[PDB]
Design a protein around this ligand. Structure first.
Ligand SMILES: [Ca+2]
Ligand SMILES: [Ca+2]
Ligand SMILES: [Ca+2]
Ligand SMILES: [Cl-]
Ligand SMILES: [Cl-]
Lengths: 116, 108, 108, 112, 114
């Protein structure tokens, strides 16, 4: 993808992802009656976009990169919770692959920006 | 200082009213609770700032208020993208949030 | 004196929490005030066990901070009709009594 | 022997606290003070365990001080529970006796 | 011992596997033993360990802080295991197996931190 766009695209992807994470939370709580892992991943999964939003408001490029690094942290924690959820049969392989692929797409873009 | 005190409490009230709409009418229970916390915590941190015993503490709490404001703005973006609120609701609340941000930044 | 008042106050906050959750279906501000309101007495107890005057005063200042936070939530709760004016004034009078007694210990 | 004694006593007290939690939730339908004392009451032993695994003296004393804080917090919730009549005077004295026994052991060790 | 530079890689892997075991212990406790208190607590502490280890992947200070949180949660988990064996909700076999896995994580974290 065009290098200039990477930040604008990762913002939009993170908002779409937050919405998917909200839906996953509802699924886990309402259908699977799972209250512990669900709360953890609701937080980490929606915090990716929140930190990207802080990054966009940075007063320095330093602060920008740092906020993106916190977004990356949150993406990685979310990936941990997703892996735990598939291994313990709270989500199907289809659910896992779909959501995890969106997560890892965000990882890739954040790393590019950070490393760019 | 008095002004952002009043405005942040008034803003907390509006967030509660938005929360009531979301739970009672839209039957939305996840994002509503998130914005309820972040949006009412802005005034909580401002009040803590008012009572601070040092300048660093004062600025530190006002910075936390600004972080809660940005979180609140984030949840509002998600609520309009997902069509749980109207553009009118979004603009009205965001106008009030912007006013508080400007005040905090001026003070900080 | 303030010790006993803070324990009685913690009981009122526990019962307010139960009212907010079970009757008003409110889970977020209720959680905040449960914490702040019961933390007052917990910190006053910690104060009594402090090994220095500085640590004694620090713990009482934290209790005072928690009292102030409590009062913010109470104000928001009456403004948003989760509690009556009568409930607010009763509970707030008790909370602010604790501010006064703490300040007298710390500063006089 | 205070080290081994406070370990044993804190584990027994933790079990008492789990049983108090069950009583409060199942019989008394009390979900708020119960949750708080479950945390504090079991945190005493948890912190004693961390103290035992401490790599330094500062870490050791820190963790025992946290245990003592958690013992004092447990006694605070116990006071709230007797005040609201969720436990009897006898129940209160019995559980409080065990908590204060731990307080004294912890202080003794910290002051060594 | 293993190479120092592999301890972080291994503790990451082991903590995920351990979180899986803890979830399975939770399911056993609630479904088979009808135990609802310690099970919920250990679920939280035991799954949190690997989450904090993942976070440490993203300052030396902050790195050490996160790993110390993971270590605290490992110890909390090990305390709940102690309570579970003391109260006879798990066998000595289950206790030793799960505890050994948990304490292998403690050892790796301590070494990485020091
Ligand atoms: Ca761009
Ligand atoms: Ca306006
Ligand atoms: Ca490595
Ligand atoms: Cl919902
Ligand atoms: Cl049970």
């Amino acid at each position: 993808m065009r290098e200039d766009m990477k930040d604008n695209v990762v913002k939009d992807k993170s908002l779409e992802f937050a919405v998917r994470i909200v839906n996953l939370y509802k699924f886990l709580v309402n259908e699977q009656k799972e209250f512990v892992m669900s709360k953890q991943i609701l937080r980490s999964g929606t915090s990716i976009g929140a930190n990207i939003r802080e990054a966009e408001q940075a007063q320095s490029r330093a602060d920008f990169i740092n906020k993106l690094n916190i977004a990356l942290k949150e993406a990685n924690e979310t990936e941990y919770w997703l892996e735990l959820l598939i291994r313990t049969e709270y989500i199907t392989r289809e659910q896992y692959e779909s959501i995890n692929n969106d997560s890892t797409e965000i990882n890739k873009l954040l790393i590019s920006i950070i490393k760019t």
